[PDB]
Design a protein around this nucleic acid. Structure first.
Ligand SMILES: [Zn+2]
Ligand SMILES: [Zn+2]
Ligand SMILES: [Zn+2]
Ligand SMILES: [Zn+2]
Lengths: 101, 99
DNA sequence: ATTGACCTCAGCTGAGGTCAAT
DNA sequence: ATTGACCTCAGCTGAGGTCAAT
């Protein structure tokens, strides 16, 4: 119903939590690109994260992500990521060429 | 873990309950073919239904199924059941040619 | 005819990607 | 660069079917 991180309309389970597309995208790219160590809260690390303020502070938005339990292990590392892309191309290959003899 | 109907190894959800393949299949065909009205307990409708005695009393087995919550509506009626059949046949011939 | 271990498969769920807007 | 609404698609789930055994 409602994103556990920011509280706007959730789109289902993402990395083991009910979240909006926004918080899902954010968390995914934070882990994919390894951005969190470089996040920094300009004030007390206790920023309110709701849907109006969720872009006001990356550090606090990510911390709230980790807190509600989003699973960093469910974001594929780059090798697995590339394999998936390859597999998707091998299957758009297997289907593409198996459809012709 | 364990079938809520008869108590042996469950294979996950079926018609909204944790059940074995046996109780799944039993409940499926009872509904598909509409058999339950014809099931009759030869003793008090209180037969123990566990994994050894489950084939001893169909009526008691089925009543258990309804009690634990198995969903009759999740069993396709002939209308949509042959509708699923037709859908699968088309796909098998399309994918069979190719190759 | 009935049982149930084992199978196929449609459609869902939840991954990663895209790209107009910022 | 970043965000997020919307996308494609592998693989899971849970229906129905099969068939050796009874
Ligand atoms: Zn959110
Ligand atoms: Zn902050
Ligand atoms: Zn059972
Ligand atoms: Zn009985």
């Amino acid at each position: 119903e409602l994103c556990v991180v920011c509280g706007d309309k959730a789109t289902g389970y993402h990395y083991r939590c009910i979240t909006c597309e926004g918080c899902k995208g954010f968390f995914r790219r934070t882990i994919q690109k390894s951005l969190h160590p470089s996040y920094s809260c300009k004030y007390e690390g206790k920023c309110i994260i709701d849907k109006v303020t969720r872009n006001q502070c990356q550090e606090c938005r990510f911390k709230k992500c980790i807190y509600v339990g989003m699973a960093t292990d469910l974001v594929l590392d780059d090798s697995k990521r590339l394999a998936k892309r390859k597999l998707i191309e091998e299957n758009r290959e297997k289907r593409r060429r198996e459809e012709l003899q």
